[PDB]
């Protein structure tokens, strides 16, 4: 009798100890008489611990409980494109049922060691500071760690917007579909975000998964995992996907809540022992597949929220260890006028130049190393002592390179527009220009090439590299413009 059903013994705080259910599986979905569904996480002889996806004011002692017989899964396929679903994969935008092609589980095994490929495919983020210093690669997971109100989401958001350059195209192997995963955010914000995507015709290749704070803790916990399965889909069918988690810091808080309430002993700061295993079996799910598998791939941009700039924290360290580098963002640099406030000193990419564009690779070789020297000289000129020709020369250029990296939000720049700017920087053609001039210089120089030397922009774009001839013309195009005005 009780094999497929059970009576509730206690209920509260989204937890429900039901009695019976001696044939239910681990992590299996269930349904109460009230209509509200739940998830079984603790299997014990006496009772079964279940977590509620909705309010608990509806469940009461002695209520009937039924099982689903299936592990919590979510609808997947192209249909979701442009739609906004919740943890479970149900539509929340109000635009009809989700037309899915298949259904995959929440928890999926990470791709094999055999079916992998070294990351070689770039991920144009449109951010010069990024594509030049810490390039992204199809199949890696680049962290975006920083304090509140710095510009973490910004970096991610602009990326999706930049993809419009190829998603409107015909070629598939070049496009890059985007999966935003809002977790812990308020519905107000999510609404405004999705509004902004549409204002840029970026919603058509974008899938959004909402797990606002108001929803139940188990939703916020499951949100990322289900969302990942959504993206994995493209990876398997030989397409490219780009998922953004924002943010795992909240997810751990959520997952911490189920543990404590299920009366599971806490580790450090109340987080469950396996809190690491929470993000490890998530990020590893994204990687570059073998040619046999489809040459498919899934890129990940995890987001973390530090307190007081303390990266030595419990959760952040757990994730820094997994991610293929991190884009550290400091509040202090933001006010100084460095926007986006990317600290090069601490931001790195483990894939490195392999992922970066070949063209942009040439124009900026030791650029990151040079910016390191700049901060070295910038700190030493604090003494208030005169500087020779060497220490002032690099100080002049290093100060302007930092000003060239500043780029406005919602303004992704193609590759053909980044190369030229960086070119004139690393060489030293901006040294002879005032700092408050670098601003308009960028826009003016671009308009110059798009009008006159447009042929070059077309070669850099297609070729993606720099030939002996292309450098010659590019060289002369730069000097000619400096002379102007």
């Amino acid at each position: 009798n009780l094999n497929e059903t059970g009576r509730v013994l206690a209920v509260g705080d989204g937890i429900a100890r039901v009695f019976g259910l001696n044939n239910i599986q681990a992590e299996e979905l269930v349904e109460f008489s009230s209509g509200v569904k739940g998830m079984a996480l603790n299997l014990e002889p006496g009772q079964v611990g279940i977590v509620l996806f909705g309010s608990d004011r509806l469940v009461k002692e002695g209520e009937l409980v039924k099982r689903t017989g299936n592990i919590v899964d979510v609808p997947v396929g192209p249909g979701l494109l442009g739609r906004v679903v919740d943890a479970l994969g149900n539509p929340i935008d109000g635009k009809g049922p989700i037309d899915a092609a298949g259904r995959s589980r929440a928890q999926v095994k990470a791709p094999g060691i055999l079916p992998r490929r070294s990351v070689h495919e770039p991920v144009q983020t449109g951010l010069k500071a990024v594509d030049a210093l810490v390039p992204i690669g199809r199949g890696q997971r680049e962290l975006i760690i920083g304090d509140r109100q710095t510009g973490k989401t910004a970096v991610a958001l602009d990326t999706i917007l930049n993809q419009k350059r190829w998603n409107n195209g015909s070629d598939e192997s070049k496009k890059l579909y985007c999966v935003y995963v809002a977790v812990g955010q308020k519905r107000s914000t999510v609404a405004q975000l999705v509004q902004t995507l549409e204002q840029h015709d970026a919603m058509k290749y974008s899938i959004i998964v909402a797990a606002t704070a108001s929803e139940a803790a188990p939703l916020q916990y499951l949100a990322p995992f289900t969302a990942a399965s959504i993206g994995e889909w493209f990876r398997d069918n030989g397409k490219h996907a780009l998922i953004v988690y924002d943010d795992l810091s909240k997810q751990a808080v959520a997952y911490r809540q189920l543990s404590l309430l299920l009366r599971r002993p806490p580790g450090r700061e109340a987080y469950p022992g396996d809190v690491f295993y929470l993000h490890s079996r998530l990020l590893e799910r994204a990687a570059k597949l073998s040619e046999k598998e489809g040459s498919g791939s899934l890129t990940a941009l995890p987001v973390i929220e530090t307190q007081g700039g303390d990266v030595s924290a419990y959760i952040p360290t757990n994730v820094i260890s997994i991610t293929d580098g991190q884009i550290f963002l400091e509040a202090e640099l933001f006010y100084k006028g460095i926007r986006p406030a990317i600290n090069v000193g601490l931001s790195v990419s483990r894939v490195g130049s392999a992922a970066q564009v070949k063209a942009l690779k040439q124009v900026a070789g030791s650029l990151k190393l040079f910016l390191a020297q700049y901060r070295e000289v910038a700190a030493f000129a604090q003494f208030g002592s005169d500087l020779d020709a060497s220490t002032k020369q690099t100080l002049v250029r290093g100060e302007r390179l930092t000003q060239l990296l500043k780029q406005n939000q919602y303004s992704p720049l193609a590759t053909e527009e980044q190369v030229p700017l960086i070119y004139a920087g690393v060489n030293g053609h901006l040294d002879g220009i005032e700092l408050s001039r670098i601003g308009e210089f960028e826009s003016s120089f671009l308009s110059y090439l798009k009008s006159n030397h447009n042929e070059l922009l077309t070669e850099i774009r297609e070729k993606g590299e720099l030939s002996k001839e292309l450098l010659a013309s590019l060289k002369s195009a730069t000097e000619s413009f400096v002379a102007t005005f």
Partner: protein, 472 residues
Amino acid sequence: TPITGKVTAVIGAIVDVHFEQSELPAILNALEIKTPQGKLVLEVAQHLGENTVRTIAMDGTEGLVRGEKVLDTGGPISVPVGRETLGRIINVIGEPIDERGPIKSKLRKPIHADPPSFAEQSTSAEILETGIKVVDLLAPYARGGKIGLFGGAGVGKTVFIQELINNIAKAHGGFSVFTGVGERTREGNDLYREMKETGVINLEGESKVALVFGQMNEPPGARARVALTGLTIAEYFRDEEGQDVLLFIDNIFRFTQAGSEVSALLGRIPSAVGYQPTLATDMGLLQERITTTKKGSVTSVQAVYVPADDLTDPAPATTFAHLDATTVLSRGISELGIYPAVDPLDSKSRLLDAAVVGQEHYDVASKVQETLQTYKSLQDIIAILGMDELSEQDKLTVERARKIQRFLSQPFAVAEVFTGIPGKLVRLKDTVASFKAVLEGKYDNIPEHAFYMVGGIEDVVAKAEKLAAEAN
């Protein structure tokens, strides 16, 4: 037949009720107990099992005897809603506490209700002029948006709000709902005086605002529900009436503070810092209800308390994410004598964009930040060496910076009894031009003192001239 039960345990603000009948009341329901003093209201929290339930007292549990009879209400704590609540002081329970007779309202909705659907969410980018320099210039508030006023103890969170009510509630045109959660009972009374004198609340006439109080003197159960009571009233005018409403809350922190006192007795495993595991959710369900929908707009000014001046504290740290505008007060600034002690650096808003406040406004603001920032980054040097060691360029930025900081201060009409200086209301238009003029270096001759507690930019030059005659 009324459902009845007996008490089995009484620990603090937590009473365990048991029902002989096989029908148990759901969660979030109310209960009442007969006493010589009146009636004690209970609220279901969780079903411990064995036809026993755990509930949270709404008032003192002194005198409660084990096995005493308990009557069921049949519905979650409800409170009267409608224009009938205006000009009346409602209690956490939903009963008049101003001694002016019962609130004859038409309908009575429960304090517990689910947050607006994602599709119902409506976003807006309209600016809201307050008159406050440090705000309308740096982090302007938005119409029907969420406002937050963080800060330690005695930094200026209430006094800041009082001014907002003296400048917006008057020229508003809609309705207002003030709810004092865990605050000095005295401030409530004096607040009542102000509403009467200003005429916002006329006993004989009509009123424009409703007063709901769950002061700190009240036990934890109340300090936990009061916020919900006040909110239910305001969401009525939002959907039912579909009219602009100003929701003033102070202080919102008490909401989680009051819940962390009982979480222990409820049998929950304390999370780090002592706060209950479900901090994120509870705080979530509250903020998600306080928002603008497609039926009406609501501007909320919530004040948040900062324990031990720690912004990393889980309580306030989970509040920022639920705000479209954040104005943090650092006691390190108030002690300087600068008021309001707004910290330009930490302060953020969503309206700080050139596509809204204008290109010039964006540039002027940014310049102010950079200047203030450069002063902070050299602060270490100043205490050690001094300005003598500062470079020519750096030394000029400091003075200018120090001028901008002092200029940020603004005399408050509400705080005139503290500063002894008549209030000063400055328009956004003049404020921008003002700082912009200071950036251009058109006032580097005027002494810094002339920027301290000054209203309009004209008043600076005026005050500078007055100091010439005082010099002997």
